[PDB]
Design a binder for these strands. Structure first.
Lengths: 134, 158, 259
RNA sequence: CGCGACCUCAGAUCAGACGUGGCGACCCGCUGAAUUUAAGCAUAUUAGUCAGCGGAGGAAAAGAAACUAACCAGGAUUCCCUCAGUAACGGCGAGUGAACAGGGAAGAGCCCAGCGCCGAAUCCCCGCCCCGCGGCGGGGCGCGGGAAAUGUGGCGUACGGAAGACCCACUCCCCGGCGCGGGGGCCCAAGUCCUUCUGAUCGAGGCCCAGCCCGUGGACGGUGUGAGGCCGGUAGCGGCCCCCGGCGCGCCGGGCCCGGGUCUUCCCGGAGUCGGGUUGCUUGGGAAUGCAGCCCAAAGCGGGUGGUAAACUCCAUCUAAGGCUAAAUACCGGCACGAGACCGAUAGUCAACAAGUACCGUAAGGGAAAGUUGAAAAGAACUUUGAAGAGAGAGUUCAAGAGGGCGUGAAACCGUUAAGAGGUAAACGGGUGGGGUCCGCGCAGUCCGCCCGGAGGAUUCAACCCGGCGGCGCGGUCCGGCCGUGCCGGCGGGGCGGAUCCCCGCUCUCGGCGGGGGACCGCCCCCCGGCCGGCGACCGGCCGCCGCCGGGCGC
RNA sequence: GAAACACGGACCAAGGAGUCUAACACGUGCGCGAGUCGGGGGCUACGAAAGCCGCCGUGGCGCAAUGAAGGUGAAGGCCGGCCGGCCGAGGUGGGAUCCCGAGGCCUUCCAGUCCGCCGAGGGCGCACCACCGGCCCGUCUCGCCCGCCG
RNA sequence: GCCGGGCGUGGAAUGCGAGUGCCUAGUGGGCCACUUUUGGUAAGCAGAACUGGCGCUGCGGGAUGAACCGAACGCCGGGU
RNA sequence: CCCAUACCCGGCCGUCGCUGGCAGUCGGCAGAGCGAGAAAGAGAGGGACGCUACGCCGCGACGAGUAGGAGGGCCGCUGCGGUGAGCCUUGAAGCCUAGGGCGCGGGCCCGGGUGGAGCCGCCGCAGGUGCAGAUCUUGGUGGUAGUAGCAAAUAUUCAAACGAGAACUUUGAAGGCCGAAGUGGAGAAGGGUUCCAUGUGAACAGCAGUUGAACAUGGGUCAGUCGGUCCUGA
RNA sequence: CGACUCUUAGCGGUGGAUCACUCGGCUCGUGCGUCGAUGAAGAACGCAGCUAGCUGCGAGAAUUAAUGUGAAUUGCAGGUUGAUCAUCGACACUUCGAACGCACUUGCGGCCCCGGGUUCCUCCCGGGGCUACGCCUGUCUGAGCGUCGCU
């Protein structure tokens, strides 16, 4: 249960804030879990997904064990395009089928200066939860 | 059109009353706002009593009530004169003063003078500056036992 | 409904003649809403009959002695296993119905401890029954912040709080109650009596001062004492076949005489 | 004439300032109706309300008695409960209608003029110096200018005040600079684990011994149906980083000499205002509650009030005609949030949408209709007929029986197919008959006990033995606990309750007062003792009887 | 008085009309009961709930009426010498129910008890009704007396 | 007017359980007929009295029909 | 001799009455009864069913109804507190139905079809809760009806071109009309891009259209001297 | 048997009810409680590569700077020493409007200062700053057979 009186639990208010979130908030909502091999390497649960990140689809018609990098993050549609996840159109051209990031596990990250400082912070505050509780 | 038997009722609903209906749905919110403001005030004056200054003992007028005793607005000037308290100092130590009251009797006068003696004795006065304890101030040890008093100070029991 | 609903227009009847139905109509214009019928509960738009007002009498007051009466009847029914079963509480393995546990449970501070306790008290099956009743509501309540509904579980009554509320508030169904501030809306949910309760020993020993025995008024209420019974021996089965009555009875005429 | 004061009064694109307009839910000042009710209507009522006009604020207004009262007296304003539908008003009809006391919320008090004292001791502005300089302020220096004696400042205001004398008592606050919780950002638990459904799973089943894992987190939302563990979040007296003021401490430059008591001697108040007459409005205010115009027009042991006009006479009570002042209170506008037994696209705002939009009117103004493909456009390539719209194939999708105003797709109405019928318009009720439509899954018709008969098959009956469990006992009254909405006993113990009767404190060693014992009574609790009863609203062990189950035998 | 030469109605869908507030009356249910009631105010996610507060019952209604008002304000009898003792809260009729009991209730015959049952008649009489007295306040008539600070 | 006592073949027939108090809707346009009856030439006219109808009510009969005659009604079988 | 819903007999439903009966299911701790015209004692010295008592059962009598009153609804709608270890992508709501049934009825339950995501039972609570009408409101659709109608101002014809397509466009010829107070050529007011070119033929131009003032793309208004600007008028 | 008409059912149309959805309302509550001559509210006109409305913005015109954020925006094109969003404290903010030089045609001025134009020599052109009403304190210039004073 939530007790913060300034945090709403209204269905219509949460859906309105979700479908009208600005871009820098779209980024956060479009986060994906990391693979098990990465989850104990950085001690980080999930992470916002960038443009060039290796990816496995876990749910849906395109699920499987194939690795594929992201090609674009279509934040306006709350969806990402993965390189080999595509379907045939009528006239013989292929189109990237969109996958929701929550239904995607990250198998390799696109590290850079700004990305690393995020991973360490998500790991720094994670330890506080285990050093304050224990 | 009156039916068989009843009262002759005169409901005062001939004006535009519906435009001036005051509903009380804020009542629980008002009780909360009042209490929060009451506690915020008690913390601001922390060692001083929460109720405020002492009020005097007072009879009620209007023969229906003269057998009872209330808490007046403030002590009269002659009650302060006999108690040996300057009228411009009594507010600074928490003694309500109003110059309008007269004293026709002596027992009402003597009952309040006796009341100020009991309060001036129970009063823990802090030094103006902790470095230099002045004359009328309390001894150093009882300042450690000085805590806020709740409820009306020296309540008036009839 | 808003005070202005259906009246913000400026309408007026066309009067008799003109072969229309004598209802106020919208004034002129070159729009669809032109001579359409504005006021009145039967028109599209316009008022609804008797606009609901905010000064309807929403709240009710109950006599204080009647409130205290109901809490006594609620608690007294929590001690009868037939009434708690009939409330649907799966309590067929509880060791003793007026369940009392030592005051050590108020020191609990982790849900892992509380769930383990309910397993030992054989009261977990009631919570396990609450999980099975977690479904979504039927009707417009879903679009009004009343999406998921479930069953009431056991009620835990504690005397003083040292963390027991934090240790139990995450378990679905559980409702925590401070023995001093008892609530009839939570001791008899739905108005039906017989909710399964779990007491702490410090809370159980405080009931003889919140309501008192019949020979000793309550110590924590100003002037209160338990209500008096209207009849002592309610077991009218044991009454009827008692000798004192059987001697004073005519013979049972049980021969059917049909036409 | 000249020159110079001063007083009046002008002009400046003079130097520096300030006002205007908007919003208007709440607030203040005016103005101010008529529908309506009275079963007509004119007074009344509607109503000091709508409309109209002006002015504000975050609140406003009110406010420190020219008060209420008649008490043993209360003591600014505002708000709530009550007073009270009361006193009163009223074609005394309809109707209208307060206040004081009492209980609460809050609580805070003050300043002038005058009267007098002080050598105008006062203020604004320019120039210079220092300090800060997005609230232009502080200090200093100016024979620098002006305001002001037609009155600035300090003291001081009805609670009295001043001065002198005499005792008494501390001499420490306030301005101008510097150093030592609230808003924003970023994060923090745990299953996408096994099988199986599906177009898609968030479904279903499982995860033993930890009946997966977290839980101070099982709010909510997202995600291809229904998610505590996929994501955002949620929980936490969780973390981190910025910003804002707070809170004291210390330094410097400052203003800063101040009080109390007794005694003597002096001083002290607001005018075309009060009040009176009259007129009109207003009020519950009635021989006039309030307000205003006109006329009259004061007093100083006076004046006002003391709810019936007047005279006389006692009391009581305040001190008008100058000013300021937080809090409790109001808030259909605004900014920002939370919630709901509300509505769910003819509803809810007029407006879920390019809505005060389209459109109408010269204008004031009036003012709509209009939500939904799918999980994802994968939005139908290509072939073919046609000038094309439109079709036939093919294809996409779980689905086109979802094909761009596309979810579901009702009725009226219409087309077609099938069946039936048809000169008293049709339709209807009751009664049958005929034909269809489907169904009965009817199409060889019931099982259930017990008994008899012959064929078979078990590990098989009764009776005893051991073990366990249960029921009941008037065990004539077994023993022990336990409890009492029973009672008695007390060299008992305590906690209270009581409108039952020595000490300390206080105001005039003895009397009075307040407090604290102590005594008594009542009640409850406890230590017992004794009974009475129950344990069928509530118990254990023995003993006996009985039943059941298990295992042996019995064969 | 409608099949009417009375009026409304072509057809279908959706909308569409005794509501809420206040007051009052009576009935009913519940709690308490000569009391009752916190509604206002305080105190300690759901919860704007609930709980508590009588030295928060102010106050409301009830417990006393009557008169315009000043006001007044709700049983008596007997004994003894206006005083002292005692009895002291009406009666009549009808009354559901209870009470007494003249009697009377089988196996072979009488005597023969306890319980239970029945009953002529006789009682205490609820509520309520009818009536007669009584008491309080207003008012009228007729009188006799008392009391003390003025 | 009070007490007390005594009298029961319950003092005509027939029928039937009575008494009593609250709260209360609708109605307050009526019409018709036998008999009696007023005004009027008269009226399917106007106005009364008594009872019963219609209104509020179908059913059998009067061919037809608010009121006439018979008879009043749950759903059915038989009889009359 | 015929027949009414009247009367008689019988069945069933309901209401009312008896303020009827039933706790006695009293079992090897057993004894199977209170139908009996007659104030009162079967008095001591291994065995069907049943009894949601708000239930079950037995007798009688009775049943019209507007305005109106009351009761009972396991009648119906929407939301809320409880409850059903309820239902549901192995198909909810909704809608359709010559299917099977229940109830006096309000209504309801199954089967089949369609549909694609939610829903219902029971105990209480709450109400913006049930439509045939209101010259009702909004929306939709009929019959009328392929009907009235497309009739004011004399008038058209031939050939060709373009084109899928020509009574209507374009060109040529012919015949006509306006007849200088024009059916001509230019302006003011008003309109506001209608002007011009190219393209299209969905809609619109009440037949048609290859055309258009429609639609879609683009283009277009040039001032010392023409007006405004200046002046005063009512 | 036909045609036509009627009834029922299947299917298809017409139509958009029902049901299920809901980034909207309505109601209650809480906190705050802030416009303008430093040009408000409102209005007009402009601003995008392709843009009509809505939205945003003002010739710096679907925005600049700054800070936070840390790789997009997206209908189609084009192009980490910080893309994009958010915040928002610097800067900017056309014409009307209390609306302010006078008028409301955008029409006529006046003053001062710069630059072309001169070579300050008048013009002409451009640019910049001023030019409203009321009122306050002060300043300057004044008026008066107002009251006076001195020559």
């Amino acid at each position: 249960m939530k007790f913060n009186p300034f945090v709403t639990s209204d269905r219509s208010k949460n859906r309105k804030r979700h479908f009208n979130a600005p871009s820098h908030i779209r980024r956060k909502i479009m986060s994906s879990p990391l693979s098990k091999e990465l989850r104990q390497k950085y001690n980080v649960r999930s992470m916002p997904i960038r443009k060039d990140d290796e990816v496995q689809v876990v749910r849906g018609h395109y699920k499987g064990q194939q690795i594929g990098k992201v090609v674009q993050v279509y934040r306006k549609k709350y969806v990402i395009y993965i390189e080999r996840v595509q379907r045939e159109k009528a006239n013989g051209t292929t189109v990237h089928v969109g996958i929701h990031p929550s239904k995607v596990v990250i198998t390799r990250l696109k590290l850079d200066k700004d990305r690393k400082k995020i991973l360490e912070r998500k790991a720094k505050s994670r330890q506080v939860g285990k050093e304050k509780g224990k | 059109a009156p039916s068989r038997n009843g009262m002759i009722l005169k409901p005062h609903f001939h004006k535009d009353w519906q435009r001036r209906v005051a509903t009380w749905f804020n009542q629980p919110a008002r009780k909360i706002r009042r209490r929060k403001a009451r506690q915020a005030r008690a913390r601001r004056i922390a060692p001083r009593p929460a109720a405020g200054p002492i009020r005097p003992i007072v009879r009620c007028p209007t023969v229906r009530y003269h057998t009872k005793v209330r808490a007046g607005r403030g002590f009269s000037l002659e009650e302060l004169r006999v108690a040996g308290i300057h009228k411009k100092v009594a507010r600074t130590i928490g003694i309500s003063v109003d110059p309008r009251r007269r004293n026709k009797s002596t027992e009402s006068l003597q009952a309040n003078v006796q009341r100020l003696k009991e309060y001036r004795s129970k009063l823990v006065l802090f030094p103006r500056k902790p470095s230099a304890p002045k004359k009328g101030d309390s001894s150093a040890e009882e300042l450690k036992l000085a805590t806020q008093l709740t409820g009306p100070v020296m309540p008036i029991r009839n | 409904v808003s005070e202005l609903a259906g009246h913000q227009t400026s309408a007026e009847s066309w009067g008799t003649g003109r072969a229309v139905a004598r209802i106020p109509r919208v004034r002129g214009g070159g729009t669809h809403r032109s001579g359409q019928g504005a006021f009145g509960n039967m028109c599209r738009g316009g008022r609804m009959f008797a606009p609901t007002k905010t000064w309807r009498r929403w709240h009710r007051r109950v006599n204080t002695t009647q409130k205290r009466y109901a809490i006594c009847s609620a608690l007294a029914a929590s001690a009868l296993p037939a009434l708690v079963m009939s409330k649907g509480h799966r309590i067929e393995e509880v060791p003793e119905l007026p369940l009392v546990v030592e005051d050590k449970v108020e020191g609990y501070k982790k849900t892992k401890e509380a769930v383990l306790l309910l397993k030992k008290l054989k009261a977990w099956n009631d919570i396990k029954k609450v999980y099975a009743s977690q479904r979504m509501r039927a009707g417009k309540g879903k679009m009004r912040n009343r999406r998921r509904i479930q069953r009431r579980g056991p009620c835990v009554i504690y005397n003083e709080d040292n963390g027991i509320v934090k240790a139990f508030r995450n378990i679905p169904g559980i409702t925590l109650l401070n023995v001093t501030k008892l609530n009839i809306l939570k001791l008899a949910p739905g108005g039906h009596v017989g909710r399964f309760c779990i007491w702490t020993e410090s809370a159980f020993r405080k009931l003889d001062d919140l309501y008192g025995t019949w020979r000793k008024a309550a110590s924590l209420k100003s002037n209160y004492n338990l209500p008096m019974h209207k009849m002592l021996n309610t077991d009218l089965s044991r009454i009827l076949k008692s000798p004192e009555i059987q001697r004073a009875l005519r013979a049972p005429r049980k021969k059917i005489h049909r036409r």
